[PDB]
Design a binder for these strands. Structure first.
Length: 81
DNA sequence: GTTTTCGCATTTATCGTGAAACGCTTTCGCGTTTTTCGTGCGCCGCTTCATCTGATGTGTTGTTGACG
């Protein structure tokens, strides 16, 4: 089948090796979740935070659908294999 | 009078010189040649991501408690 841009997006996380002093003063290693268009490989959105949790995923998704919209056939992949 | 030597003349030979000629080797000059050197890109293979980061021992100082 033919894959359109925005038709299939993959979500992935990343743990940073950089020490950052956050807004609350604590020095932590940030974790960022990214949404990527599978066809073009363009990163469509991200959210960074102090730990891995659903909020960054949810909000980065919000950023993606607010900026580029929701396609009529929408596939989302998060590989938990 | 006949022959032989002696004095003078003309022609040819050659030198010493000076400027020039040729012929050999040496270079440089320029057009076309040959190698080396950089800059440049594309391909292939290896490796990590699909989840990744900090301590100990001894000395000195500060604070707090006890004692005078």
């Amino acid at each position: 089948e033919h894959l359109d841009a925005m038709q299939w997006i993959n979500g992935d996380g990343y743990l940073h090796n950089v020490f950052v002093r956050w807004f609350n003063g604590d020095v932590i290693r940030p974790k960022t979740w990214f949404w990527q268009d599978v066809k073009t490989r363009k990163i469509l959105g991200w959210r960074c935070d102090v730990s891995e949790n659903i909020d960054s995923i949810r909000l980065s998704f919000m950023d993606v659908v607010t900026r580029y919209g929701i396609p009529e056939d929408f596939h989302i992949t998060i590989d938990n294999t």
